[PDB]
Structures are given as C-alpha cells and as structure tokens.
From Swiss-Prot:
<comment type="similarity">
    <text>Belongs to the protein kinase superfamily. Ser/Thr protein kinase family. CDC5/Polo subfamily.</text>
</comment>
<feature type="cross-link" description="Glycyl lysine isopeptide (Lys-Gly) (interchain with G-Cter in ubiquitin)">
    <location>
        <position position="121"/>
    </location>
</feature>
<feature type="domain" description="POLO box 1">
    <location>
        <begin position="39"/>
        <end position="117"/>
    </location>
</feature>
<feature type="modified residue" description="Phosphoserine">
    <location>
        <position position="4"/>
    </location>
</feature>
<feature type="modified residue" description="Phosphoserine">
    <location>
        <position position="79"/>
    </location>
</feature>
<feature type="domain" description="POLO box 2">
    <location>
        <begin position="124"/>
        <end position="206"/>
    </location>
</feature>
<comment type="function">
    <text>Serine/threonine-protein kinase that performs several important functions throughout M phase of the cell cycle, including the regulation of centrosome maturation and spindle assembly, the removal of cohesins from chromosome arms, the inactivation of anaphase-promoting complex/cyclosome (APC/C) inhibitors, and the regulation of mitotic exit and cytokinesis. Polo-like kinase proteins act by binding and phosphorylating proteins that are already phosphorylated on a specific motif recognized by the POLO box domains.</text>
</comment>
<feature type="region of interest" description="Important for interaction with phosphorylated proteins">
    <location>
        <begin position="152"/>
        <end position="154"/>
    </location>
</feature>
<protein>
    <recommendedName>
        <fullName>Serine/threonine-protein kinase PLK1</fullName>
    </recommendedName>
</protein>
<comment type="subunit">
    <text>Interacts with CEP170. Interacts with EVI5. Interacts with FAM29A. Interacts with SLX4/BTBD12. Interacts with TTDN1. Interacts (via POLO-box domain) with the phosphorylated form of BUB1, CDC25C and CENPU. Interacts with KIF2A. Interacts with CYLD. Part of an astrin (SPAG5)-kinastrin (SKAP) complex containing KNSTRN, SPAG5, PLK1, DYNLL1 and SGO2. Interacts with BIRC6/bruce. Interacts with CDK1-phosphorylated FRY; this interaction occurs in mitotic cells, but not in interphase cells. FRY interaction facilitates AURKA-mediated PLK1 phosphorylation.</text>
</comment>
C-alpha cells in the first residue's frame, strides 16, 4: 500500500471541499467493497518503558515495544510473529516458551488481558503517535486509523481502495470511496475529519 497514495487521496478529497455543496448525497458515496477487514479495535498506551499494545478487530493482539520491536499474537491465541528492530520476522508460538521472549510475551498477555477485560469498541502496527485530539495508528498494510478522543469517532483510511471508513458518534460503520466523496459530498463532520487526517498523514510521512 502507501502513505503517499493516502496523502494524495486526502488532498484530492479535501480539495473537492465535499461538505460545501447544496445537496450532499453521502449515502451515494458508500461502497461495500471497500469495507476494511482489519482495524484496531483496542489499544493501550504504556509507552512509559513498555510500549503500545493493541488488538485488531479479529481479536489478534500486537504490541509495538519501546525498543522498536513488535510481537504479534494471532487470534488462535498461540501463533506469534516477532519483528526485530531491523524488520526481520520470525514466527513462534507462545506455547513453545521461547526464553528470549518471555518478558515480551508476558507484556503481550498483560496487554491482551487488559484489553479483553477493560476496553470495548496479518498487519501489524507500523507507527503511531498521539495529538491531543487523536491517536493515529498506521498499520503495515497501509491503513491508517485515527481515533478521536472527544468523540470516539474513528476513521480507517485504506489507500489500496482509496477509501475511508467512518465510525460515527452513533457507532455507525460506514465505508466510503474517497472519489465518490468528491462527487457526492459529505457532512461537515466527515470533511473536517478528513482535513485532520491529511495533516496526520503528513506527520506520518515526515518521520
């Protein structure tokens, strides 16, 4: 996928100014085929010398550690992917009891347990950061997801299908083709989030 493609998809929709229209026909911009399969349903920020733990919507879990390593637990509850700092991927099982990785497995079980019990609502978490408005979550498959704190509104940007999922204040899950947003327009809310999203993708590109 790519952030560059995303930035342009957002510039292009934001340039269309989709909320400044007589008739907005947002429903007409929905495309069931862009409905994403993966997104982050849960996250825990323990970036104080542990890291960021998360759960995808298929109940897999992952954590991006502070040492820039990542450990991914598939939803079978056993299959691990471990990604070294340098990008090198190995596959193991929790049950195999790999001693070099027990501390991180334990942190992952901590995150997983915490998330099952205390939060509601394979690509891994490439980068994230926070901004007082949102957490921004960039998956390895190119998706970026911005969760807004005040609202609990969420955007799942999917650059392979030039698409966006927006989760309303009402928990409505609606998927749009960005170019269809250009044609048909959308509400001030979505438009304003896509504006924010674009600045967020600059920040992801910047690093």
């Amino acid at each position: 996928c790519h952030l560059s493609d995303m930035l342009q998809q957002l510039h292009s929709v934001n340039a269309s100014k989709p909320s400044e229209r007589g008739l907005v026909r947002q429903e007409e911009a929905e495309d069931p085929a862009c409905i994403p399969i993966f997104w982050v349903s849960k996250w825990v920020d323990y970036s104080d010398k542990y890291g960021l733990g998360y759960q995808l919507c298929d109940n897999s879990v992952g954590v991006l550690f502070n040492d820039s390593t990542r450990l991914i637990l598939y939803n079978d509850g056993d299959s691990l992917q471990y990604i070294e700092r340098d990008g090198t991927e190995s596959y193991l099982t929790v049950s195999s009891h790999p001693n070099s990785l027990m501390k991180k497995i334990t942190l992952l079980k901590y995150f997983r347990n915490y998330m099952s019990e205390h939060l509601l609502k394979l690509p891994y978490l490439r980068t994230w950061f926070r901004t007082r408005s949102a957490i921004i979550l960039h998956l390895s498959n190119g998706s970026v997801q911005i969760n807004f704190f005040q609202d609990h509104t969420k955007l799942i940007l999917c650059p392979l299908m030039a698409a966006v999922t927006y989760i309303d204040e009402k928990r409505d899950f609606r998927t749009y083709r960005l170019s269809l947003l250009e044609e048909y327009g959308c509400c001030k809310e979505l438009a304003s989030r896509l504006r924010y999203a674009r600045t967020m993708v600059d920040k992801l590109l910047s690093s």
